[PDB]
Amino acid sequence: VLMKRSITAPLAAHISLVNKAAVDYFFVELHLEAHYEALRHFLLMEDGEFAQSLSDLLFEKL
Amino acid sequence: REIITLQLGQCGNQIGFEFWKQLCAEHGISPEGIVEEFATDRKDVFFYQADDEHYIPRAVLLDLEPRVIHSILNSPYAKLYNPENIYLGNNWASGFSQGEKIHEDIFDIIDREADGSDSLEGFVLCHSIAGGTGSGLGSYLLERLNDRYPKKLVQTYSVFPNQDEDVVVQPYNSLLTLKRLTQNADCVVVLDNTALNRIATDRLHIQNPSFSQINQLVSTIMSASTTTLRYPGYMNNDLIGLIASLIPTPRLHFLMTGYTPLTTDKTTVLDVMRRLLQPKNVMVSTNHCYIAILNIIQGEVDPTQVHKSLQRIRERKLANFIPWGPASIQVALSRKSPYLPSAHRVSGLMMANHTSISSLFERTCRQYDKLRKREAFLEQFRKEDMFKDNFDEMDTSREIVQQLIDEYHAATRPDYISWG
């Protein structure tokens, strides 16, 4: 057969390590998994004491 | 929002102290009022924010001829609450007149807490109907709250006198308190003592200490009502948003109570819904139809099984509802409480407006009518005579409850678009 089988071997071994370490850095250093459950409290209006205070004040005007 | 609990009578002070001890054990609080290192939760529903980060609870301790209140004092949990609310019989008329003379001082106690709070939403009244010190005094005080405060809500965590009786004056007391509950209260949570005693004798074989376990059951139900308020959810974090869905008209405001773990002192959600529809799990002992059904669960829940299971309860076709209005079984989910042991992980509660309580009300009505027409069980007491020389308030309460039973049975019919 013709194919790369000793040139791809130190290469594909590096691609996966790079991608998984790059994904790991975001979560365990910059807390990207917390920013989602942060925007969920406000932008989806999940949390109580915020939606019941924002909409109730805003709709009195219009 | 912000709720101050009001407790009166010896039994009512017992269940309020049990409620505050349950909330001390539930939240990260010491019995001194000290905040713990693991307390984050919302604690402004029943706990006033004090100065050294103390969540001092909002309680009004009121008593009539105190005996068990000394034992309530004899505890390390009497230093957790009590922000200076202290103050010093067996008939409805006696307790009514006894509250009638002292109304100004207890109203000053209420006024102190009212001006003290930033906001307020509801009044929780914990006392037993026809329990002596609770009855009469509670109806007078209820008249005074809804006369003085029409801006708030009234919820009543009460037991109804269903214990099969010697005190024979209790149906008169229950009917007079019931008239005050129908026209001066927005919601009354009704339980049967016999059904709770049957479940308590079912789980273990107790004969005498049923009352202590019933206190724990009412404690878990009252905390279960506000777990979505104290712990961040989404909906019915206002009480009125929860109360509105069950009540179609302000005379039918009585809710059935059921709790699906019955050994309490993981499972599929459609199963515990069908379990919660049983009267073996319901705390209340012709065809009757539910008016509206809304249920709470807090525990180990699959977030996708809710639509599968609500479809399965729908296509099971198990409950038969009321043909004039478009109600639903409404599934609501709350958070399982942290900072406490998570055992019996699935815990559900139901609050539903059913016409089956009209049968129990009609039993008490028939008992009142029989003992009133026979006239050997009111016995013309001096407190009842000094309260009313003519005894027409009992007839007025009879008229109100007769109208109520008529409204009940007309709501069961498909003709309640016109008034009944």
Side-chain angles (χ1 to χ4, degrees):
Chain A
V1 75
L2 272 301
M3 49 195 306
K4 311 303 146 174
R5 288 167 293 157
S6 65
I7 300 170
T8 193
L11 187 54
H14 195 89
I15 300 172
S16 46
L17 185 67
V18 156
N19 291 136
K20 297 291 105 178
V23 163
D24 196 5
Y25 293 155
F26 288 171
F27 300 159
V28 308
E29 298 182 337
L30 307 163
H31 285 309
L32 184 51
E33 302 181 332
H35 300 163
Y36 297 130
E37 73 166 33
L39 60 87
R40 148 161 174 95
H41 291 182
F42 299 136
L43 285 83
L44 302 176
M45 316 187 93
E46 198 270 306
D47 216 340
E49 310 183 70
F50 175 80
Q52 301 305 127
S53 158
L54 184 56
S55 319
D56 192 17
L57 292 176
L58 283 198
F59 293 147
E60 286 177 346
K61 304 297 186 289
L62 61 82
Chain B
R1 304 181 55 187
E2 294 87 5
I3 297 176
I4 298 179
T5 88
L6 314 166
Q7 53 180 353
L8 69 118
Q10 314 183 8
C11 56
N13 291 325
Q14 276 167 294
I15 69 187
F17 172 67
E18 192 63 57
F19 185 60
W20 291 128
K21 186 145 49 66
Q22 179 55 46
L23 265 59
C24 189
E26 181 187 39
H27 302 323
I29 314 171
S30 85
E32 266 54 51
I34 308 280
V35 58
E36 297 318 295
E37 287 70 334
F38 40 84
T40 75
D41 41 8
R42 188 215 167 181
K43 291 162 78 175
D44 285 322
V45 202
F46 306 88
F47 312 101
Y48 182 82
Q49 174 67 42
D51 285 85
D52 208 356
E53 229 10 89
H54 299 289
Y55 283 104
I56 295 191
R58 304 155 187 162
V60 176
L61 173 66
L62 295 178
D63 53 346
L64 177 61
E65 311 179 331
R67 185 271 291 163
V68 77
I69 293 98
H70 313 295
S71 59
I72 291 177
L73 263 194
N74 284 25
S75 66
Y77 299 92
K79 290 184 287 169
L80 159 72
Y81 64 110
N82 194 93
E84 216 277 312
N85 52 8
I86 69 182
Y87 183 73
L88 287 176
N90 317 277
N91 299 119
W92 189 92
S94 73
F96 197 85
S97 0
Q98 278 168 118
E100 188 163 285
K101 44 180 181 67
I102 66 180
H103 61 285
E104 278 313 312
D105 317 14
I106 47 181
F107 183 49
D108 227 286
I109 295 178
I110 295 304
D111 276 352
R112 176 176 69 254
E113 298 290 318
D115 316 347
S117 38
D118 198 9
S119 194
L120 201 63
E121 170 75 24
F123 296 104
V124 170
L125 264 67
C126 38
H127 62 96
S128 129
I129 303 304
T133 53
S135 122
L137 173 61
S139 49
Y140 181 80
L141 232 124
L142 181 73
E143 288 157 355
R144 303 285 73 71
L145 327 140
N146 316 30
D147 283 347
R148 283 305 306 195
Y149 302 97
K151 292 305 184 272
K152 309 301 168 181
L153 253 105
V154 165
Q155 203 175 213
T156 304
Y157 291 96
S158 138
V159 294
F160 216 64
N162 177 251
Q163 297 158 134
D164 297 355
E165 307 193 64
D166 195 8
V167 170
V168 309
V169 76
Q170 59 180 355
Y172 315 97
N173 310 326
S174 357
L175 209 48
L176 293 153
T177 325
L178 183 59
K179 174 178 56 182
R180 270 83 184 180
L181 282 181
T182 53
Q183 57 181 4
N184 309 125
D186 314 336
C187 174
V188 171
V189 160
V190 202
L191 290 90
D192 281 3
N193 308 103
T194 46
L196 293 160
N197 206 10
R198 282 168 207 163
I199 296 178
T201 52
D202 219 357
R203 48 177 174 206
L204 332 176
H205 291 67
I206 59 177
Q207 278 73 263
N208 320 339
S210 196
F211 294 107
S212 85
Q213 319 310 312
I214 290 175
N215 301 147
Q216 314 303 326
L217 283 166
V218 188
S219 252
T220 65
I221 291 175
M222 285 185 298
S223 28
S225 44
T226 90
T227 315
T228 192
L229 272 79
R230 296 164 311 182
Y231 290 95
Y234 202 110
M235 272 288 120
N236 305 349
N237 317 332
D238 52 327
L239 179 67
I240 183 182
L242 185 146
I243 294 303
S245 60
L246 306 174
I247 296 169
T249 201
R251 315 296 103 202
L252 326 177
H253 55 269
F254 301 93
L255 308 180
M256 315 288 288
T257 329
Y259 181 71
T260 204
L262 283 183
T263 303
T264 300
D265 292 359
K266 272 227 287 178
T267 189
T268 161
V269 281
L270 105 129
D271 259 348
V272 261
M273 283 311 159
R274 182 189 283 156
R275 283 151 201 181
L276 206 48
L277 268 178
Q278 270 192 337
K280 331 180 186 179
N281 291 100
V282 150
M283 311 310 200
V284 171
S285 302
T286 163
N287 161 265
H288 280 308
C289 61
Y290 313 89
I291 304 177
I293 294 194
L294 157 74
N295 39 75
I296 263 296
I297 194 174
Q298 52 253 11
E300 274 303 302
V301 293
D302 227 341
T304 194
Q305 194 178 25
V306 322
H307 50 77
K308 300 306 184 190
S309 304
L310 170 67
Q311 188 68 238
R312 279 173 288 184
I313 303 299
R314 193 263 183 192
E315 297 287 77
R316 166 64 170 84
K317 308 276 182 183
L318 171 64
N320 46 359
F321 291 82
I322 183 171
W324 44 262
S328 277
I329 294 191
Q330 318 165 71
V331 198
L333 178 55
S334 137
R335 287 184 49 179
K336 177 78 166 175
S337 214
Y339 324 129
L340 143 120
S342 226
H344 311 85
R345 279 154 190 258
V346 190
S347 261
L349 176 70
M350 50 154 309
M351 290 305 179
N353 201 2
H354 199 185
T355 46
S356 55
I357 200 58
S358 165
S359 42
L360 274 300
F361 286 150
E362 193 156 85
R363 286 166 51 175
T364 319
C365 254
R366 169 194 43 86
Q367 286 182 320
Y368 164 75
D369 287 350
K370 177 171 60 189
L371 298 194
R372 174 63 163 168
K373 292 163 209 316
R374 284 165 69 184
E375 193 66 28
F377 301 93
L378 186 82
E379 301 173 49
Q380 290 299 99
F381 286 148
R382 303 308 303 168
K383 305 303 292 182
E384 299 165 346
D385 201 12
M386 290 286 279
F387 173 71
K388 204 64 180 57
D389 279 341
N390 266 293
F391 303 92
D392 325 317
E393 309 291 329
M394 318 160 59
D395 294 331
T396 323
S397 186
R398 156 182 290 179
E399 161 189 72
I400 293 298
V401 68
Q402 181 68 28
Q403 286 172 290
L404 193 70
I405 293 298
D406 293 357
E407 283 164 313
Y408 281 156
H409 294 161
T412 334
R413 300 307 178 273
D415 260 343
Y416 203 44
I417 301 174
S418 166
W419 62 290

